[PDB]
Every structure is written in C-alpha cells, then in structure tokens.
Point group: D3
Chain length 267, copies 6
C-alpha cells in the first residue's frame, strides 16, 4: 500500500515502525555481547562508563577495543611514551574491572598517528568477525569542534568496519582461515551532541568518577579541579533532556540511515 | 556598493546583479552534463528521475563511475571480479532506460577510493576532454554519510571542477593537447539542504524499474525495504517542492564553495 | 561542591566563568605575540587583515605562517607555477608591510597538495615551540561548504599543532636539540560562520582592500569587479552581528571545548 | 669457538655444527610448504616441476597468490575484472595438474601490490594459521627484475617469515587465537645464484602443459617465444646441476638474511 | 627442434639470435623517435649528451622527459627553490638547443620528493602513448652505490611505464579519451656500470662539456675543477671497453630479460 | 692537463689522489665528532662496537642516533612492545657507557615500521645540522641478502640526510629557527660485504662481546650459543682481509662516488 502514501510524516512512521522494526524504547532488547571502541585508554569510561556498569550488572558481556597506546598524553618530561603506554594499560585494566569489563583488545597504533586506512578497517573487522557482537558503541565522528584526529578517525573507521564485516569480498583472507562474515544488529554513538536515547547514571555517577580517576597519569589532583566539574556538567546536559540529574546520551539509528538518507537527522 | 550599510541589501545585490545567480531556471544554456557516481547505481538512485527529464529535453548526460562496485554482495559464491562484470552490464542496462549513452569507468576498487591528487587528475582529464556545461556530484556534507567512497567522491568532484581551469594543474594534460575548461553549473544530489526541486511523480515508476535493473543489489527480499525507503526519500523532497515525489538538488554560485560564511543562507 | 548543582544552565555558567575563567569581552588581554596561519598567500589579509592592522598598531607582534607556495592560482597559460610562487612571495611581503607584519615562515608545500600528515604537524609545532606565541589564528575547518582541501587541512593541522606543542613525547627531537614544549593561551578561528567575537574594521577597511589588492596576480581589474562587493558583503555580515558597518568575525572557545564537549556549539 | 683464528675453519664449523645447515637433503622434516607467487602462473613457471615432485612424495603444497592478474592482456575487449575470473580458473586448472589443492587469493590488483605493513600482516596471518614447515618465494635480488610486484613479493615474503614468530607483530592475530609460528625452511626461486637443484627432465612435459593451462597468457604466437625461453632457463639450471633440465633454488640459514657479510659465500 | 638441445650455451645463442632477433651491432636500426628520461635537469646531457647530438645529427627526433624541477640543487641561501626551478628550465632549454632537442615534457615533481607511485607511471604512460616513440633511454636503477632516490625511482618508473603502456587495462581513461596502447621497440640504460654497447663521442666531447656547462647554477668554476676530470674519467672508462678515447656506455637487452631471466647478466 | 690523458687506469689514479685527495691510509684524519646511525638498539655495538671503543679512547666524540624503539624484538608472549622498548633503552644506555658513548638521540619510529619518507630524512638532517659532525657511520644499504626493511631504509635515509643537510632549500624551517646547513667530511658504511678499510679489534673483542651481551633481552644464554660463534666468525672474515685475527670492515668512498659513478665498485 506504500505506493499510495502522499504524506512524508506517515511514510516515515510506517518505514521506522513496520518496515525496519526500529525501537528507541528498548534498543538493547536482544543484545548479549557489545564492543566499546575507544580511541584512547579512558575514552570508554569518560564517554559511557555509567552505561557500561549498568550493562554488565544486567549480565551483558562488554568488550573494549582500544585503537591507540595513549603514548602522548603527559606533560611530564620524565615519562617516555613507552613508559606511559605500560602505565595506561594497567590503568585501563583497573578502570575496566570496576565496571564489569574483562576483555580488552589493544590495536597498539600510536596516539596522534591513528591512520584513516583500509589497514585499520581490516584490524577492526577481524575482531568483529571473531567476537560476533550484537552491538557496537563508537564515538560520533560528527561531534562539532572535535579537533583530535584519533577521535574523528575512530568514529569513521568503526562505522566502516560494521558496514564491511558482512561483505565476504572485504578482507577475504579472514574467511579463508575460517572466520565468518558477521552483521551487527545495533550501533550506538557516544560523545555525541545529537543524542536520541538516554541512560540514567545518577545512582552509579560516584563509581564512574572513581573509574575515571583510576587513570592517575591523566587525572592528577590539579587537572581533576577542572575535569570533575566538566564531567558533571556533561552529565547534567544529557540529564536535562532525559528528565534526571545525571545521564549519558547515545545516538541510535537504523543501519540504513548511515547511507544516502537526507532525513537521518530527523530522529 | 561602498555606500551600503545593511547586509540583507548587499546580499540580494551580490546574488542578483553581481553574480547573476538564477535558482528559477539554473540549467538555462546547459547542453552537456557529467553525473559523478561513487558506485554503479548511485546516479539512478540519487537523481535517475531528473536524468530521464534531462535526456528527454535533449541534454547529453555522461556518467563517471569512480569504483567497480566489487564489494556490494553478501553472497560467498560471487568473487568481486565476477560482481564488477555483473554491475557493469547492470549500469549499462539502467543507463539505456534513462537517456544515457556514455559511461567512464575509473576502476578504483569499491571501499578503496583514495582522496588523492591522482583521482583529481583522472576527473580533470575527463572534464577537459568532454568540456561539460554542468556537473552533478554527491553532497560530501550529507549528515551521517558513513561510506568513505561517497565522502571522497563529493570532495574530489568539487576539487576537479575548481582545478580544471588552472593551466598549472596536471600540466601534461595541456602538453598532449587538452585545454583548461570552466564548468558553468554545479549541482549536489543526495543532499539534506536542497534549494531546487524536480517533480519526478510522472517518471517515478521508470526510476524504480531502472534501479531494479541492478539485480545484484536489489533481490526481492532487499527490495521489500528499499522500495518504501526510496519512496520515503522522494516524499521528503516532495513536501519541500509542493508535489508527491521529487529529487532535491543544492545549487550555489562557484564562489560560495570557498570562504563564504553565509553560504548556507541560500 | 558542583555535586549539589542539578541544573545544566547553572553548571555551564559556573564552568565558563569560575573553572575555565573564559572571557569573550577582552579575550586578547595578555597576548603580545600571535601566529596567523594561512593556507595560501593572501588568506591572512582577506580573512582578518583589518584585525592584523589594529593588532600591530597596538604593538602586538603578528607573525605569518604560510602553508603553501600558491603555485596553482593563475589561469594564464604563460606563467609556470614556479614563476607564480616567486610573484606571490613578493606580493605577500608587500601586503604584509602595509599591515604591521615583518616575519613570514614559508612551509613551501605545493598549492592543492597540502598533506594532512604527522609531517606538517611537526613543521608547525617546531615554529610554535621556537616563537612561543601567546595566541594562534587559523581558518575554521568546519566552515560549511569549504571545498578547498588546503583550507580544511590547515585548520585541522593548526588545532593539532596547538594541542601537541606542549607534549614532550610529540616530535621529541625538537626538545633534544633544545626547543621547549609551549602552551598557547589563545585560539581564534577566522573565515568562520559561527563567530562569537567581533572587531570593528570600518576605519581600516580601505587599507585592508589596498593590502588585498597588493596580490595583483590574484586580483586583476575584472576579478576585482566581483570580489570588492563580495568582501564588503562578508564585512557587513559580521557587521550586523557586531552592531557596526564593517567587522571581522572570530570564533573563540576554551581549549577544553575542542575535545569531547557536546555543548561546544552553545557559546 | 673462542680459540679459532682462521675464517675458513670457523665458517665450516658455524654451518655444520652450530647451525646444523644441510644442503644435501634440506627438505628432511618438511610435510607442508607455502609457494608465494606475485601473479597467477608464477609458481608453475618458476618451480612447477619441483611442485609436482613434492606433491608426488606426499608433501602438501599451498599457493598464496598476491595479485588478481588484472593487467596481463593486450586484448582491448577483455576488462581486468573479466581477465581476473579467467586467470583464477586457469590457476585452479594448472594447480590440479601439479598436486595443489589450496590457493589463498590476497586480491591486490596486478601492478599495484603495495610494499606495506598491511600486506605483511595478510601473509603473517596465513603463515600462523597454516603453520607451514617451509616457504618458497621469488628472489627479490634477481638482477634486472623490472616488475614491481616481483620485487615487493620477495621482500614481503621474507618479512612475513621473519615477523611471524614475534608475538608483538600483528598482536590482534594472537588475541583472536592464532599462535606465533617459526618456518624451518626458506627457498628462493626465480634466482640467478642457486645453490640447490631439482632434476625436472622427467616432468618437463607436464610443467609445460601446466604453464599452457594459462591460455590467456600463452596463445600460440606468444608460446613460439616462451617454449624456447622456458627450455633455455631449465638448461641454465641444468648445466649447474649436471642434468638436462632443472629448477634452481637458493637455500640459506634464516640467520644469513640479516647482517651477514659472507651470506654470498654459500 | 629446440626440444632436442642438451647444451645451455647453444640454446642461449639460438634464443638471442633466432627467436628474439637481438642485435647489439646496430640496435638503433628502426628508431626515428626516442624519449630520454632524466630525473633532474642536466641528467640527459651528463649521461648521454654526446649520443643525443650524434642522434639528432642523423635526423632522429629526441624528446626529453624531466621528472623533477631541480628545486633543491643549490648551496646559495639567497635562491629559493622556485627561483632555482625557473633558472634550471632556462638552462636545460639552452643545453637542449645545443644538442638537437626541441621538445621537453616537465612532470614538475619536486627534487628529492619523486614518488615511486602508480600516479607517476600514469604520467609517463600518457606521454609514451601520445608520442609513440620507437625507443626510450632511462638511468639504470641497478647502478651500484646510487644514493639519489630520484635516480632509483626514475629508472624503475620508466621500465614500468614501457612495460604497462601496451596494456589497455592500465590507465584505461587514456584510451577512453582517444590515446592508443603503444609498444616501445628499444630500451637503453645510461649511467650504467654493466654496459654492452658503446657510442664514440670523442669528436663531440667538447660540445657535450659546453652543453653541461650551460647549467651554470650546477657548474660554477670551483665545482667544474672536480667535474671536468670526473666526466672525462667516466668517458675514458666506457672508452677502454669500446676501443676509443671517449665513449658513452649503454645496456641494451631484449624486453623479455627484464623479467624472471636468471641469465640476464650473461649479455 | 686532464683532457690529454688517453688511459682510464691513469685518469682514475689521478682523479682519486690529486683531484679528490682521497686517503684510505688515514681517512679519519681531522674527525673529532662522528654520528653512528643504528636501525635498532644494539646495531651500532654489533656492527662497529670495537671501532667505537677505539674512537672514544682517542678522545673522538661518538653520538648514537637510534631510528627505532626495538618494540618487536622478543619471542616472549608476556613482554608487550612498550615494556620491551623501555628495557632496550636502559640496555643501550648501559652498552653505550661501556664504549665511550654519552649522547643518544631516539627517533622512536616503531621497529619493522621505519618509513622511507621525506619526514625521517628531515629528522636526521635536523640532528646533522645541530651537532655539525665531521663524519657519519651508517649501515651499507647494498648488503647482499639483507631482509630487514629497517636496515635497508636506515642506510638509504642516512645517505640522503648527509647529501641534503648542506642544501638550504631542504627543510627550510630548520634555517628559519636558526640551524645552518652543514657538510659532513666523512661517510663510513658498516655491516658491509665490500669493505676497503679495517680496524683491528683483537685487543677489545672481549669488551665488544660484553657490551653486546648488555642487551640481555636480545641475548639470553640459549640465543648466545649461536651468536658468540657468529660474531667471532664475522670478526674473522674482516680479519683475514686486514691480516689480523679479529677486525671490523668499513667501506669509505668519496662523496662524489655515491652519484652516477660507473667505476664506484673499483675502490
Ligand atoms: Zn581520546
Ligand atoms: Zn554508493
Ligand atoms: Zn572549454
Ligand atoms: Zn586560500
Ligand atoms: Zn612557553
Ligand atoms: Zn609475475
Ligand atoms: Zn607453530
Ligand atoms: Zn640527477
Ligand atoms: Zn603504437
Ligand atoms: Zn672561468
Ligand atoms: Zn638491527
Ligand atoms: Zn656546519
């Protein structure tokens, strides 16, 4: 009957609800395993640490992929990048335990030098095909005024990896050695300015801040004077829109809307 | 112009009198246009209705296809080389149904279209040879466009248009006897900020047949989702144009693609 | 506290005013030396030439960095790119004298071929660490409909250079030969469509246009017929928002807002 | 070793007692080998006779083909995608005639095989999965070799062998449950400094049939030149081996591919 | 026939003489048009200037392809690379007139930054397909102890261009706009240490040295003190092997011997 | 008088001895400061450790440049690359003290991923211009059967850096921040198969082996069973040619012979 619809608003509701079976009310329905893709050690916990704790509490398996080693993130002239990499691995392991996270994949690209290349797509696809996750969380590459190249590259690479994982001609040696081409059901953008889904983290906010603080190298007492207020202000910003004190915002869309969809921004 | 102190007046004066910019009939004196598609099918899905309307009015429409479409199957039994051959026949078939006779294949692999000087030169070489009056290309600023080939194609196409008239750009082209060429017209399809509309209500059924010609891409089960999707897109452009089904284009003066802070105000 | 606040609007005002000590009213307070980063010879003067004259008059040292040689910017079949590069160096030297500008750094990347690479980041960091400037002006890489690759690359590279200059592990050979990490106090985006700060250039507009016209290769009489009205229309656009006739618009944000800040666009 | 003061003595002692290097029977403990070919046909042209002799003695021989062979025709009617499909069937046919069952296709385009970390990882992934005892690869030091794919394949293959055993190299391979692997044997084919020879006089006619299986590459007119060429190569290795027709290999200890100034002395 | 040969030496003589019809005595039999590919302005004249004069005298059309602009080749702190490029264009034009050379193609890659890429192969193939030359002269990329990256890249790129020009699937847009595949009959390597063919240049040596000296920027009086003796010593080295005073050495092989030929070094 | 020589052998002797003033008998005459360029931590000491001790004993300043971090060089699954980098820095510092070496520059490129790029050339040129060394030692990039990409790249990059350091248009920002072009007097290739100069290390051989063994991560007891005999066999190979027990072999040529010299291999 779709041929004889003459109003956009009607066709849109019909496309989302009946054709795509898209659900914003409970979009995590049948997800048991999710990947969180972080550009740097700490990005997962700062972006969506509260939501990760809430997920592992409900018995959802949450696995980290860390794109970089975090080699550059110190102003101390006494800490070489190799020293800092070891330090931030221990820190992210510690931070991961406090939320329910057991498994981390390290790609080991150098901080500030994450290529936007076919090579990094293949590395991510290899992990998606092995772990066969139901959902993937990744930073929104369209975050206005995001100046960090690793953040822009990670978001775009992660969306490519999700879209190309189910194509048997993409990185075909993966299938030849016995991995299978996998479709992810769910995509969530964190660190986003246009969220359409909210998780209340008011009850776990104190644990989130403790798990951020586990990154001692990144949050000495002097830096923390600025960041505790910043992180609370972010949590309030998502909070206003969710009708709670403290929240984490996600943008969830159907796979289809990430390609040639001029009304994609209308959810 | 020295004596104007209000922006709104200077803006109307710049568009109307200085630039002589015309949204009412922007295809006035265009006889030949290039449609630049990242993949086989992108031209017909994006602006197939408009292409039929153009070739009917006797305008020559030439495709440039950036990639071979090697990756676009979930069938483990179709190699990329097999699929490339298949999608060439499909786009040839789809092209005949609209009035399109000439296709240039650059043969970059699907998902691996470089954003490089090299692909700019390939496009400039075609622009200088064919001397087209207008170029259609996908809007690289489409919100939430995740396909790298789509982003790269839009940016590369705008670069090619801007650099084709510069004799120092790809100078070997001139040494073997091509000439610099200036394009009159730029149109962005697959856009979320269109400012010009073509009614395709009368040709919508032909457009869908010409999309369906890409059998590899639209089996019956996929088509269950895509017919409604493509109709919903056509309705979205429709609402803004005051018809049922439309294709949206963004048209701006060449000048507004560079250091223009009010570019989004047309 | 900050724990006690449960309204976003309050936390936001508190974060800007008290935590970050951000001041839009006089943001150039303690800046004595600034770098202006231009993709092409002429971009500084066209973008913010009026502001540069006002700065050098008040005794602020303004230093240009030019990313490219301007090799491609002619339609004359008789002028090779090497010829035009020499010509536009003389032109930018001439244009620079008319405003108060004495020092220009030429990176000498070819027009239309400015890489977005670690290599160009190092080149810019080397200059920032040597000159120890208090502020940096650079083109807004998020300018809607900016099709020139050199403009997009320059803005992103400049923000990276500013962010990485203070990191001792970034381009470590710089410190080994006796340069020091440097933190830039001030970042200003010119050629922007979301300006939040304005400089009146009504009094110096005629000098700005003379200094643009000094680029003879780029502004013959026929081209100038279009560009004088264009440049006046731009100056009026910033003008309306500033409550003057002719202005230059800048976007100024705290350094923190260029990373994972979902309300960045809300100043 | 401390109290040796003559090079010639220390050299014999290093090879025989320390490294336990054996040129007389170097395939002692090899059950599985990879043959790495830049193009479809390179394995059979380079060492087809040796491959037949190996599979007859029950050794598993697995091909890795780096490229699709997209460029290797002067026929204006055959697109590269068409030719790729054709040369896959041809190499499958040629592979059956020798004892070869498994081919891995990397699907890099002919003439565009990068010398990159990315292609190293692709090869390491296969070496770690298949755990082969030996690897055959084209000698990248072949004088006057003009083909970039041949130079890149040889260097990449030696890198892959050297880096496969390092757990920090392509660490995601181990995280998903592959293991580091050390290859026991390295053989260079298409070499001008061979130190080991296989008699192929008895299987020469089968080798030529298996080369000819690549019809796209060896029409009757091309074959007029190549049968004599391939015979002349086989005679060149022959003279040095004391038979009519041979295939020459260079075998060295893994150690001699790094900072060994007397490497050329075996 | 060839099946019943049991001697390498016999099959080798038979392959060269009868099958390949290879002729070292007069290898320039049917060549009317040749390309000389030089990495830098001056490389053609220094390498084979004498041979070029002897060729243009006999009415052979000799066309230069210059890969780079020669931007880096001065120790003078006052001469920008753009200045030097203009200067070395005039110099090579002057040097070219003195030998019989009328047409030079400038690719305009920067000195020291000549990529070994598909892109430069396409540029060279485009010229080979347009000019349809019978022969190509290029520097021997296997020259022992050649440290200049532009020299190594030029030799390899030139051999690739020759090998790929006849393949319709290589740079297919060239054919779509109406160029045709072209097969080059003749390949000569200059600047080679394993030459197998010699041209007597004793009678034109003084003109060669004048045409080298035309590159004033490259050969001031002090540099020339070293280079006149060097260039004479090179000419004597080729001379001894040719049985004359002064010669230019070339390596000529069948096209076949540049691919999987283990006895290639045996001519 | 060079015009009226008619024999190569005579011109060759005359060019080396009188024109170039090339001296193999005492080639380190006026060198007080040398750079040793090593691809990996340990390459300097394994290649020419004995010669380094003999140089620092005579009061010559020897400065290391290490291209890579040595991240990949372990088969232990429990040592991350970041851990191993820290470990091999301490090891090379220890090994350096035992020979007379005080100063090491770390470029910090990852083991196995040393680019052959303009970027690494600039890094090396920056150090050559700052330290103004009289000589440079680097691994022979033409070593037959060298399979390590870092070894091939280091040798070529080092020769480029030496050749481009004196060109003011190469890496021009170096001069703008106050470094000067520098000419290196001396180039020595170690890890070479065609040496023409030898240093007796018989008396310091057991110190060299101790300084190699300082790299504990690289030489456990089991690995050392193979390498002590290997390193002794190498030292004997150079030994035979020098008429001593244990030696280190170097190739020294005039700078001129690294460009378009067909008789380069004839010294
Ligand atoms: Zn981060
Ligand atoms: Zn597409
Ligand atoms: Zn035209
Ligand atoms: Zn500009
Ligand atoms: Zn400072
Ligand atoms: Zn091949
Ligand atoms: Zn194993
Ligand atoms: Zn040169
Ligand atoms: Zn032809
Ligand atoms: Zn004089
Ligand atoms: Zn090493
Ligand atoms: Zn100096």
């Amino acid at each position: 009957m779709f041929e004889e619809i003459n109003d956009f608003e009607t066709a849109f509701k019909r496309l989302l609800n009946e054709v795509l079976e898209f659900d914003l009310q409970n979009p995590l329905k049948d997800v048991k395993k999710v990947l969180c893709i972080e550009p740097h050690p700490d990005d997962c916990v700062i972006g969506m640490g509260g939501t990760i704790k809430r997920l592992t509490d409900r018995g959802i398996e949450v696995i980290y992929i860390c794109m970089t080693d975090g080699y550059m993130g110190t102003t101390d002239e006494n800490i070489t990048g190799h020293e800092l990499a070891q330090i931030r691995r221990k820190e992210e392991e510690e931070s991961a335990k406090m939320l329910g996270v057991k498994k981390i994949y390290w790609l080991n690209y150098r901080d500030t030098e994450l290529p936007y290349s076919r090579e990094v797509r293949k590395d991510l696809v290899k992990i998606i095909r092995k772990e066969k996750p139901d959902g993937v969380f990744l930073p929104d590459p369209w975050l206005p005024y995001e100046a960090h190249p690793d953040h822009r590259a990670t978001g775009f690479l992660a969306l490519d990896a999700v879209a190309f994982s189910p194509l048997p001609n993409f990185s075909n040696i993966d299938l030849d050695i016995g991995l299978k081409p996998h479709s992810v059901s769910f995509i969530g953008l964190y660190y986003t300015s246009r969220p359409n889904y909210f998780v209340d983290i008011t009850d776990v906010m104190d644990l989130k801040l403790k798990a951020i603080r586990a990154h001692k190298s990144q949050f000495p007492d002097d830096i923390w004077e600025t960041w505790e207020p910043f992180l609370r202000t972010v949590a309030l910003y998502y909070g206003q829109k969710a009708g709670v004190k403290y929240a984490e915002g996600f943008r969830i869309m159907p796979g289809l809307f990430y390609h040639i969809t001029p009304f994609a921004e209308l959810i």
